[PDB]
Amino acid sequence: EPQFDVGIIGGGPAGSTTASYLARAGLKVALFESDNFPREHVGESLVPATTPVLVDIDAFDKVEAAGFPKKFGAAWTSADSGPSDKMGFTGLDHDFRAAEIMFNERTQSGVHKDYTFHVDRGQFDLLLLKHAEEQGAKVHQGVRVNRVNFDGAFPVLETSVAGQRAKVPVKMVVDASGRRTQLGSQLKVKEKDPVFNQYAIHTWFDNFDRKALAVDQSQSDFIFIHFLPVIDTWVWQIPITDTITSVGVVTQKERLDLEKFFWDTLGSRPELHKALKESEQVRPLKTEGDYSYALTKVCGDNFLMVGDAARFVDPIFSSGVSVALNSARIASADIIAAHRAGDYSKKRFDTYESMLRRGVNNWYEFISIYYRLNILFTAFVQDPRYRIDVLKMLQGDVYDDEEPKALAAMREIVKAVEEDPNHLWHPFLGSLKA
Numbered sequence: 165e166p167q168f169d170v171g172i173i174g175g176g177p178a179g180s181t182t183a184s185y186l187a188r189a190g191l192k193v194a195l196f197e198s199d200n201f202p203r204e205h206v207g208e209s210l211v212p213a214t215t216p217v218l219v220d221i222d223a224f225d226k227v228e229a230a231g232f233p234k235k236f237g238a239a240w241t242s243a244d245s246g247p248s249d250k251m252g253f254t255g256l257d258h259d260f261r262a263a264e265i266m267f268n269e270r271t272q273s274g275v276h277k278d279y280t281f282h283v284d285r286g287q288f289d290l291l292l293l294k295h296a297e298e299q300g301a302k303v304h305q306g307v308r309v310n311r312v313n314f315d316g317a318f319p320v321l322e323t324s325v326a327g328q329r330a331k332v333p334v335k336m337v338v339d340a341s342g343r344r345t346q347l348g349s350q351l352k353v354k355e356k357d358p359v360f361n362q363y364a365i366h367t368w369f370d371n372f373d374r375k376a377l378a379v380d381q382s383q384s385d386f387i388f389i390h391f392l393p394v395i396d397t398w399v400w401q402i403p404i405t406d407t408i409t410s411v412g413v414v415t416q417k418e419r420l421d422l423e424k425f426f427w428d429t430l431g432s433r434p435e436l437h438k439a440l441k442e443s444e445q446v447r448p449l450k451t452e453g454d455y456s457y458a459l460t461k462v463c464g465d466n467f468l469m470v471g472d473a474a475r476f477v478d479p480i481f482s483s484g485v486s487v488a489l490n491s492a493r494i495a496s497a498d499i500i501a502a503h504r505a506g507d508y509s510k511k512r513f514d515t516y517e518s519m520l521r522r523g524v525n526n527w528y529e530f531i532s533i534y535y536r537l538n539i540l541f542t543a544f545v546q547d548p549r550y551r552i553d554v555l556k557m558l559q560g561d562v563y564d565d566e567e568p569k570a571l572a573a574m575r576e577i578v579k580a581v582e583e584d585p586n587h588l589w590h591p592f593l594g595s596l597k598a
């Protein structure tokens with residue numbers, strides 16, 4: 165039998181977190197990362213559901229010590245003021261133009277702080293990858309996994325070392341290759357979402373004064389997500405340091421030169437546009453895929469996928485890294501139990517498969533509602549009857565519940581509205597549907 169219990173493809177948040185859980189449990193873990201860290205990567209704003217996982221693997225203190233900007237909350241704004249009839253919803257202080265939350269408004273199990281972080285992902289992924297090594301994981305960088313061979317009793321990772329093929333047998337493979345979906349693509353189980361086909365254009369700016377433009381100065385270090393309903397396009401502002409800010413524009417592929425589209429979109433708000441033009445652009449505009457997909461298989465005999473390698477959803481709720489960390493957590497529990505049973509057949513991962521489906525279905529449905537009736541999202545966040553149940557989702561706490569209270573409530577309102585073209589809210593239904 166192979167020396168190594170588990171071979172991990174990729175050393176981003178999902179891969180490094182998996183390595184840390186498994187190494188801490190005493191399994192022999194080999195991890196292979198194609199790049200050398202640090203390397204640039206989008207996806208910077210965390211939610212607090214990352215916290216219990218960072219504490220589990222004892223990485224929270226290092227992350228806190230690194231000096232990433234603290235994130236106490238989030239704001240979602242829209243260009244649409246919405247209907248005059250608020251239908252009994254309260255807390256809409258700016259019509260339907262603005263919703264805002266602080267994470268500390270709801271007590272979250274395993275979370276001991278009022279804040280999470282926004283992170284330079286180059287630095288964050290390096291920090292976590294070195295941490296995994298310190299836990300006892302065997303980490304390789306500059307070493308790509310080209311394929312997984314299933315011809316033997318145990319899977320073999322075919323890696324590439326200076327143009328040479330190095331075949332590494334392991335008992336169990338974890339694909340944590342992110343959007344590269346290394347194993348899902350090999351197995352041909354990857355299904356692109358017919359509807360969520362987003363792409364992003366984004367960069368960093370230096371010496372843009374977040375606090376100067378903020379309508380609530382105390383909130384200048386929140387993430388801000390601005391929605392443009394008419395063109396189903398969103399715009400992010402994410403703190404990177406005290407002086408650097410990440411700004412991105414996200415839109416359907418069909419709607420997509422690029423530099424001009426980026427700026428015209430930001431120009432929907434002349435003084436943000438101005439402030440950014442007058443700041444220092446510290447990186448080229450980058451355009452990348454942001455499209456949704458799901459694998460029809462996320463596990464099988466001697467393999468499973470975690471993080472983006474398993475599924476992707478539009479990160480309007482800053483969800484991705486929390487899925488990476490929590491899929492790692494849940495998958496690692498099944499792997500440790502499988503190791504204890506001396507068997508890695510598909511059934512060993514039934515719980516991981518169900519929980520991943522449940523949690524990311526919850527995100528997907530939440531995201532669907534945001535797009536389908538955005539004014540209802542705004543109302544549910546703001547109205548104190550529903551705010552806390554909605555905040556549970558926004559905190560990333562989506563693994564608890566096959567049928568979250570807020571999601572079911574919102575779902576039937578969308579239905580009621582869809583099925584009555586007389587509804588005063590009917591005209592606000594968005595074109596992006598399920």
Ligand SMILES: Cc1cc2nc3c(=O)[nH]c(=O)nc-3n(C[C@H](O)[C@H](O)[C@H](O)COP(=O)(O)OP(=O)(O)OC[C@H]3O[C@@H](n4cnc5c(N)ncnc54)[C@H](O)[C@@H]3O)c2cc1C
Pocket residue numbers: 173174175176177178179196197198199205206207208209210211307308309310340341342343344346364412452453454470471472473479481482483484485486488
């Ligand atoms: C535009 C955009 C904005 C986003 N914003 C946010 C946000 O605000 N908050 C948030 O939480 N999430 C966000 N996300 C999502 C987030 O970036 C991902 O969910 C996250 O990176 C998932 O981590 P991961 O470890 O699964 O994948 P990754 O972080 O991508 O890591 C995978 C690693 O695998 C390596 N790899 C790939 N193939 C191979 C191979 N064959 N062999 C070896 N190594 C390999 C790669 O080099 C990479 O380092 C955003 C995503 C996009 C596209």
